[PDB]
Nucleic acid binder design. Structure first.
Ligand SMILES: [Mg+2]
Ligand SMILES: [Mg+2]
Ligand SMILES: [Mg+2]
Ligand SMILES: [Mg+2]
Ligand SMILES: [Mg+2]
Ligand SMILES: [Mg+2]
Ligand SMILES: [Mg+2]
Ligand SMILES: [Mg+2]
Ligand SMILES: [Mg+2]
Ligand SMILES: [Mg+2]
Ligand SMILES: [Mg+2]
Ligand SMILES: [Mg+2]
Ligand SMILES: [Mg+2]
Ligand SMILES: [Mg+2]
Ligand SMILES: [Mg+2]
Ligand SMILES: [Mg+2]
Ligand SMILES: [Mg+2]
Ligand SMILES: [Mg+2]
Ligand SMILES: [Mg+2]
Ligand SMILES: [Mg+2]
Lengths: 58, 69
RNA sequence: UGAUAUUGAAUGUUGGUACAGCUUGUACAGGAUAGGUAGGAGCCUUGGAAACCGGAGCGCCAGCUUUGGUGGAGGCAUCGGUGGGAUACUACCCUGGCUGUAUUGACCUUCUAACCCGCCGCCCUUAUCGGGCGGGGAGACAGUGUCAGGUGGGCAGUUUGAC
RNA sequence: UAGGCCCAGGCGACUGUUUAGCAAAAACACAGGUCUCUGCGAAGCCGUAAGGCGAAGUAUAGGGGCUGACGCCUGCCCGGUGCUGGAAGGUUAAGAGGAGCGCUUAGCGUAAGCGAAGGUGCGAAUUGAAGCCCCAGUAAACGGCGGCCGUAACUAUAACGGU
RNA sequence: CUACCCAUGUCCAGGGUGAAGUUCAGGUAACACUGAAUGGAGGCCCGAACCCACGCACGUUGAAAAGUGCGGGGAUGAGGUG
């Protein structure tokens, strides 16, 4: 699970409360699924919403 | 014997536009019979067999909430 | 449970953002209830004008050089303007207002290309997986990502004084 | 080789299951009863997700809670808590919205200070969901079924009247 | 090993009791029913194999790190077992 264009992933980090007591946690990447041309073949893959902002076709 | 007539729904202001759409969108749920069009609303009134007086009472009610009950 | 991205189109109702317009200056005062600084006398006559009321203007409505109507055929500047202006025009501008404009949002619908279908037909193929092409259903919702608020012994880490 | 029997009570209806190795039962289970959730990709459950069980079932079905054959029955209380439902109002985050105020310096400077643009901080009003505050129902839901004074035997049955 | 589940096999000497139904009769209004014959149901009865573990005694550096002896319970089923 990762964007096929920019290669974003999901990372790990803490999660603080009011009293700063830590605990593990994860950070998703806002991926979407769209039919897209790839290496001369159309396909539906994962791609981040940020990449979709500009400079891409569907 | 048709406790309510179609002309009653007509005069109630239940014909198209936006105000009448709000009228039905309110009245229906106030009677627990969901949404409909004019004819569909009349048919629902008929099938659930609801009494005229309660219909008028809810009518006045929703007009009051429209007028700020 | 909200905001925000994915996330589109057409409405309608809608609050405003500026454009465009003609506007009452009521002061207990000038014949008279004639703004703000103002150049200031020159204009108007077959704009039935000036006497004039309301219909741009306020209103217990009085009248206004603007103004559809009979109210008919000159005042103002110049005339005690009690005046906190003396006004041809108004070089510039404001309250009485809505329209078309640029709107922007918020609602209320509608639609269809997004996204979804443990629906159907055909193909890959001998396959209840999968995806490819058609149909259908829903549809900018839902699902998913980030942020926020509730609830939360369901599950964790701990405390519970001395004489 | 091969049933001691009878008369009374308590508990549990019955056959069954249970602490391998100190407890075999009155404990558990059960046929029946009742309450409640679930319109199908059902509810619930396992898994982070795919994927499954439920079920190749469809409310005469499935999950959960209490009670526990059969016969006679299950009284009063909705203030509190839980759950279900509703509207006038109050309170409430993130995000929008940014009034206004600081620091810095072109300039004026005159000696003190005032200080245009830009930058950089701080942020007013206005708006902003559920929940909570509130109201109604619900008890084979969690729960509750009193004190005083005067008045009737049997182990004072204080039954009965007044606060 | 033990707990529960899934697929596929297998084991239970012998004897009792006699449900439904059916057929006869009597019976009644036919019915209700009564009595015979047939029939062979059952988480039925008695009891070996098998499974379990209620009482007592013995053993307690044991024959055995949970047994033996004499009695006991279920034994066609919510069975036992490979
Ligand atoms: Mg991957
Ligand atoms: Mg740590
Ligand atoms: Mg949270
Ligand atoms: Mg704890
Ligand atoms: Mg520690
Ligand atoms: Mg001590
Ligand atoms: Mg028992
Ligand atoms: Mg027993
Ligand atoms: Mg034991
Ligand atoms: Mg015993
Ligand atoms: Mg024992
Ligand atoms: Mg039961
Ligand atoms: Mg299945
Ligand atoms: Mg019990
Ligand atoms: Mg009991
Ligand atoms: Mg009771
Ligand atoms: Mg038996
Ligand atoms: Mg045992
Ligand atoms: Mg023995
Ligand atoms: Mg027995």
């Amino acid at each position: 699970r990762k964007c096929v264009i920019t290669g974003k992933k999901t990372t790990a980090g803490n999660n603080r409360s009011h009293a700063m007591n830590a605990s593990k946690r994860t950070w998703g990447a806002n991926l979407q699924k769209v039919r897209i041309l790839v290496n001369g073949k159309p396909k539906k893959v994962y791609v981040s919403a940020r990449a979709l902002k500009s400079g891409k076709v569907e | 014997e048709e406790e309510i007539t179609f002309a009653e729904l007509i005069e109630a202001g239940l014909v198209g536009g936006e105000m009448a759409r709000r009228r039905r969108q309110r009245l229906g749920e106030e009677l627990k019979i969901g949404y409909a069009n004019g004819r569909q609303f009349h048919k629902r009134l008929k099938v659930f067999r609801i009494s005229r007086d309660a219909f008028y009472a809810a009518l006045a009610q929703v007009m009051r909430e429209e007028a700020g009950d």
